[PDB]
């Protein structure tokens, strides 16, 4: 009685709605598009065929499409250097290519279209997190070697603004670089080559010779990344956006801060604090036009993910590997962000090892629920926490895979789609679970090593809980 | 809904798919949904890893560990799928690998390209017993047998086309000589001198019904008018005994495993012999000669008791030509015995390039591939009766077709011409009816499941492709 009858799977993905999955791949160097309604691949894209030789497919956003069966359009970046080193291929490549692109590109309803690369337009090579703005009409990217974001008009591909983040540590000493405190510099830069061309393509810029690895933020005191500039590194990770406007929050990994910009005059106005026990924010102050600094008499612990609530009230960062949790800012005053306090911790006596991180998250549209992967090396099965958003406290947490990356939501809030990515070796996955029920539905196999995924949006409401409030 | 009532109804079996343009190889678990391991052929520094045809092993558990080989194809096989890229200088590729999963992830173990010089880019083929494999390539034409413990290489032959008309379009149709010649090594090492690009005589490996296009000088190459498009090396199941395919003269050349000879050529063309003799014309030289081809052939492969065997003709005429070959003693004595035809089968389209027998040999699936954007499907056949009995549409650029060895479900795979919709489609053999897709990034054309068995290797990448 173990074998099911004949079982056609029409039921399981009628349930989900018509909803696009897009992936890119990692270490596959692929992108690729999933119709939930049918289980069909729509599309996919590989960087080499373009003659991109290290395509380390890494982060992503989707702008919203009336119809995204007819047509859509996303950004997908790379990393490239000596990142193809790092995840254990025993690989014999000498010199690995440059990378660092930032691709545009657009679903036509039969393929996917390579549109440009903004990095070689621009030249701001950025490798780390994609997101797209509330309104859909421009984006930013993050780079945690070489400490630069900024954000990008879309229909022009030109860079509306470029920073400079550098750390000054109290003590030289590796080990304790970040422990004892130091001072963090915040420059707003301007390009210097033809054509308001900034000189960052490729491995240019990069304080250290390859990204600090998910759980691996340590690496670096813990004397394990090369690099000429290691003790200046913060590892800016992403921009995420305010629903509401004006605002939006730099994740700086190392000093565990996330500095909160006014997107209307390009300037940082306050420095939120990640660790519990230390102060809700740090002052910032303006040093000369196009510089500012925060003061940090210690670091705590590093911070990972940050993400607004979908009515912009509540801004989360997840402390790692020093202390595991989830901090909660009250950030209902829109005036002004000096004003935003701590309000809740959520914590576990599970989250007390080195492991697991809490890492990337996606809320209902409600806001009533965050869902947060658990994070783990080998071999630990990785999991996802689903945590209650009115009252800050744990709720469940289920065992789904290895290296458990990132989640999206289906936009009427019933499905919570996630991925897990095998350390770019063993077995990896998409996952979909019911957010009534909190219970997995099913895994669907995945040829890919994803750190990103997103439904894609129809709407500005749906950005709302997709990659732009959240990572 | 949960998914585990559909994975359920299979049983335990790892599908192994290689990617095509994607440069990826990859095996999931058809009883979870997991993908348990892949690898990128670039991060190594393949850096045209067009990931083609695979064969894998018989394994006592797969799910602790399995073996399989992979090749791929280079040069400019890149610009043949209409991606618009700008690279000028593609990667040489043509790389043959040994992968062994570990119960973990994939392990590339050697590059047997590199250690023996031959770079071939066609189909890849398990021997019945398990312990070796061929490849073939219609580029350079030609094929080898490969021991896979010593990686070493068994035979080797390269077929040669001298038209009787040395005009282009009619190089063909007007009959030829076929010279079949046993190669030996050139370089220091016993090693030959076939890496990459190099014995290409024409530079891709011809497309569906691209018989015609190479007729009408749309293929560039060194040696157009010398190409016989070798496809693949099919194994007898009963042993002895492999048959090599030769599109453009649309003949099977029978070859003897054991003292490595040919000794037959079956003619697939309905209204011609069963076959012509191979006369040797020196030591390590026989000849075929044709008066006339009727019509070029593609898919060929036996049944899994070995007492048929398959051609399917196609461009000028479209059918499914059958041979008895129970006389396992003398392949000269095999015999065209049914014709498998279709009103809605002509011309170059639906081309039929890869098939599945049941276990029992009483049905066979055959894939209907079209070009854009004509829906592409699967034929069910009666391998008894030689009648067609159902095709079903199933999406865009339909390729290889695999069975679970319990006989009970057919897993094949679409691959969007490299750019539109792909995936991995699942049939019943009882009511013949798709019972779902899962989704595949890959442009596979190639698909196995792990054989536990050297039974198994009847109904997998051995006796068929
Ligand atoms: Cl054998
Ligand atoms: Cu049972
Ligand atoms: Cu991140
Ligand atoms: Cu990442
Ligand atoms: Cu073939
Ligand atoms: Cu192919």
């Not at 992503?60 to 950004?75: C, H, N, V, W």
């Not at 692109?101 to 279209?113: E, H, L, Q, S």
């Not at 999206?408 to 077995?427: L, N």
């Not at 996952?431 to 099913?442: A, N, Q, Y």
Request: aromatic share 10%; net charge neutral; glycine share 10%.
């Amino acid at each position: 009685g173990h074998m099911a009858r004949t079982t056609k799977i029409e039921e399981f993905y009628a349930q989900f709605g018509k909803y696009i999955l897009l992936v890119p791949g990692k270490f596959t160097g692929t992108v690729a598009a999933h119709d939930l309604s049918t289980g069909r691949t729509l599309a996919w894209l590989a960087g080499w065929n373009y003659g991109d030789t290290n395509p380390i497919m890494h982060h992503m956003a989707a702008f919203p499409s009336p119809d995204p069966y007819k047509g859509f359009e996303f950004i997908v970046n790379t990393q490239g250097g000596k990142n193809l080193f790092i995840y254990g291929i025993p690989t014999t490549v000498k010199e690995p290519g440059e990378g660092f692109n930032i691709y545009r590109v657009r679903y036509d309803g039969t393929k996917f279209n390579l549109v440009s690369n903004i990095a070689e337009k621009t030249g701001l090579g950025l490798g780390v997190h994609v997101t797209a703005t509330p309104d859909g009409k421009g984006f930013a990217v993050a780079d945690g070697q070489k400490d630069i974001f900024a954000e990008f008009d879309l229909a022009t591909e030109s860079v509306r603004t470029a920073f400079l983040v550098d750390w000054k540590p109290n003590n030289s000493d590796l080990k304790r670089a970040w422990l004892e405190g130091g001072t963090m510099t915040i420059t707003r830069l301007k390009p210097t080559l033809p054509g308001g061309k900034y000189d960052y393509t490729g491995t240019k810029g990069c304080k250290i010779d390859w990204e600090l690895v998910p759980g691996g933020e340590l690496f670096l005191e813990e004397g394990k990344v090369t690099g000429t500039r290691q003790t200046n590194v913060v590892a800016l990770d992403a921009f995420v956006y305010d629903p509401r406007g004006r605002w939006g929050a730099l994740s700086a990994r190392l000093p565990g801060v996330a500095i909160i910009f006014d997107r209307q005059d390009w300037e940082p106005v306050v420095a939120l604090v990640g660790a519990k026990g230390e102060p809700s924010s740090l002052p910032v102050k303006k040093v000369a036009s196009d510089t500012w600094e925060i003061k940090m008499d210690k670091v705590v612990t590093p911070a990972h993910q940050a993400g607004f609530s979908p009515d912009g009230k509540n801004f989360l960062f997840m402390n790692g590997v020093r202390q595991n949790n989830i901090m909660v800012w009250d950030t209902s005053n829109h005036a002004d962000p000096t004003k935003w306090t701590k309000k809740a911790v959520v914590e576990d006596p599970g989250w007390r090892g080195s492991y697991p991180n809490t890492f990337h998250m996606v809320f209902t549209p409600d806001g009533r629920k965050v869902y947060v992967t658990l994070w783990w090396p080998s071999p630990t099965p990785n999991g996802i926490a689903v945590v209650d958003a009115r009252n800050w406290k744990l709720l469940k947490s289920v065992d789904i895979g290895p290296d458990m990356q990132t989640l999206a939501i289906t936009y009427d809030g019933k499905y919570v789609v996630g991925v897990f990515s095998g350390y770019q070796k063993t077995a990896s996955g998409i996952v979909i679970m019911d957010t009534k029920s909190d219970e997995v539905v099913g895994i669907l196999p995945s040829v890919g090593g994803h750190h990103d995924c997103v439904i894609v949006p129809k709407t500005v409401e749906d950005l709302r809980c997709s990659r732009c409030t959240t990572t």
